[PDB]
Structure formats: C-alpha cells, structure tokens
C-alpha cells in the first residue's frame, strides 16, 4: 500500500452489509437531493456534502436512499465541477507547496514533497484523460495552476 510512502495503514470506512435505508430514516429520496444541491451551491465538494449529511442529517449513505452516487447527482444537474474534486485538491496542495518554496528555497524537503504531489497529479490526470473526464489535450502546467484553484 501507500503509492508514495512506506506506510501500510489500513484505516478506512467499513460499509454496512445492508443496502437498504434504515427503518428510522424518514426523509424522502427527493428531500435529500435538494439538500445535496443546496450544499453544493455553498461550494461544498461531494466529499464534504456526504460528511455533513451523515453528521447532521442522519443520511448514512446517499446511495442507499437516493439510488445514485453524490457526484452523479450533481453531474445530472449541471453542477459537477470541471476538475474532479480529488484532482483539484492534489493540484491545490502542489500550488501551495510551490508558493512556499519560492519564499524558502533551501527547504529541500518541500521540493521533494512537491515532486511526489505533482507525480500523483500526472498519473491521476492521465487516467481522467483516458476515460474522457478531462479533454485529451488537458495538460497540467505548473505556471497556470493557481488560476484553476485560487
């Protein structure tokens, strides 16, 4: 495990055996979608929408209630971001490290971490291009990354 480390951590979520909604869930499959779209317009990405839903609304999984995954619902309503969320956060972190490097040039560790982060961007961006999530001509440029995230 751990593409860019020696770690072998196994921490993750354990989905329940049941694929049906809990008996106590009373909200409809409708009421959740407007709740999901409402939070997406607040600027929340699908990961942070799902955490708030279970944290504050008792929605254990949006799929067992609505029937579709959360990002699939935004994409059906024209609210899917152009860059997928995980790739955006990889690029945003890489932007942040380089801005720190430009002020601290002797931070040789940060230069090393930046190479790992950007390599992770190119491998994932290459995947998003084969599946036509990104344009075939989409390429990550270090100079113009700040425009995309800032």
């Amino acid at each position: 495990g751990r593409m860019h480390s020696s770690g072998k951590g196994i921490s993750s979520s354990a989905l329940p055996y049941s694929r049906n909604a809990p008996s106590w869930f009373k909200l409809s499959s409708d009421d959740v979608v407007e709740q999901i779209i409402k939070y997406a317009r607040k600027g929340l990405t699908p990961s942070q929408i799902g955490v708030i839903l279970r944290d504050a609304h008792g929605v254990s999984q949006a799929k067992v209630v609505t029937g579709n995954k959360i990002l699939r619902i935004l994409k059906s309503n024209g609210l899917a971001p152009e860059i997928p969320e995980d790739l955006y956060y990889l690029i945003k972190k890489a932007v942040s490290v380089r801005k720190h490097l430009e002020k601290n040039r002797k931070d040789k560790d940060s230069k090393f971490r930046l190479i790992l982060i950007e390599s992770r961007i190119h491998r994932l961006a290459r995947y998003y291009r084969t599946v036509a999530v990104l344009p075939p001509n989409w390429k990550y440029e270090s100079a113009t990354a700040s425009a995309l995230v800032a």
């Binding site: 055996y17 049941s18 049906n20 008996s23």
Partner: protein, 181 residues
C-alpha cells in the same frame, strides 16, 4: 377484474381481486389500493396441508405495495385460510449472450439471472431484512444457499420460511435455508 393487468385471468385471480375490492371498505386504507395492480397469481402446495400464494406484480408498482404489505398480508391470509402470501415482482431475465451472438444493447445487471434470483429471495421475506447469506458446497455436488434474517418483524414470517424454500425451489431449482440467528 380491472385490478388484473392480464388477459383471461383465472378464477383464482378474480377472487384475489375480489378481495382487493373489499379491503378499501375501511377508509384507513382506501386512498391507495385503487391504483395497485398485479399481473398473475402462481399457487403451489407446501407440506402440512397448506397452500402457497405468490402474487406477481409489475416491478414499478412494488414500492407502492410495500406501504401496506405488512397490513395487507395478514388480512388476505385471514380471508383465505391456510394460505401463505408473498408478493414478488415479475422481473425479466435476459440470457447471457453467446460468444458468436449478434450484438444487442448492453444487458444491465438488474436483468441478469443471479441478480433477479437474489431479488426474488429478498422479496420473499419482505417484512424482515437479510443480514447474511452463506452457500455450502456439499461433497455430493449439490449446493445449498443459507439466508440469515433479522429478528425485527420476524413474527410476520417466522412461522413460514419452509413455504419460502419450496416456493424458491419451484422458481429456481435451487435449495435454500432461512435462518434467524
């Protein structure tokens, strides 16, 4: 006979719909039993002198039946004694295409035989929910499924289960065992 979505219903199909035109009499459950419809009623004999009643329903109408099925099963089984009532949707199974077969549109997984049989086995035990399935592969060669059910609402089916296994055997040819741990 307007309740039945099939041409030339059998006499048994008419009687069940005749029951269907009598339970809306109490208005607590009247505002929703009018749109409910079904296509066929396949009936088989289980051991002990009882008879199994399988109600076949168009798949889009199932979620409407589930709102009153808990009530509806207890009263229709009283009206028809020594009858075990389950509600199944007549899902369609598309055979797996052969290697040299002419290309058709991609078969969705919900139309596959494993998924449909997993579904009728779940519609069979509606009041309860499935908490686990195991499959033993005995040395003789035959295979037996085991289904473990949740104790909530167990009282609606806990006296049957044996009717379900033989009814499932009728539909699939496989052996199943229902267990409430």
């Amino acid at each position: 006979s307007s309740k039945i979505l099939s041409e030339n219903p059998t006499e048994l199909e008419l009687k069940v719909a005749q029951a269907f035109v009598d339970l809306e009499s109490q208005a607590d459950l009247k505002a929703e039993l009018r749109p409910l419809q079904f296509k066929s009623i396949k009936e088989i004999d289980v051991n002990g002198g009882k008879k199994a009643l399988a109600v076949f329903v168009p798949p889009p109408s199932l979620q409407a039946y589930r709102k009153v099925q808990t009530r509806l099963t207890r009263e229709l089984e009283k009206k028809f004694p020594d009858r075990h009532v389950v509600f199944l949707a007549e899902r369609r199974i598309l055979p797996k295409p052969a290697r040299k077969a002419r290309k058709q549109q991609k078969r969705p997984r919900s139309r596959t035989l494993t998924a449909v049989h997993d579904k009728i086995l779940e519609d069979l035990v509606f009041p309860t929910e499935i908490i686990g399935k195991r499959v033993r592969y005995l040395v003789g060669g035959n295979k037996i499924q085991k289904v473990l059910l949740d104790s909530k609402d167990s009282t609606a089916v806990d006296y049957k289960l044996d009717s379900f296994q033989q009814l499932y055997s009728k539909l699939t040819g496989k052996q199943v065992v229902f267990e409430i741990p």
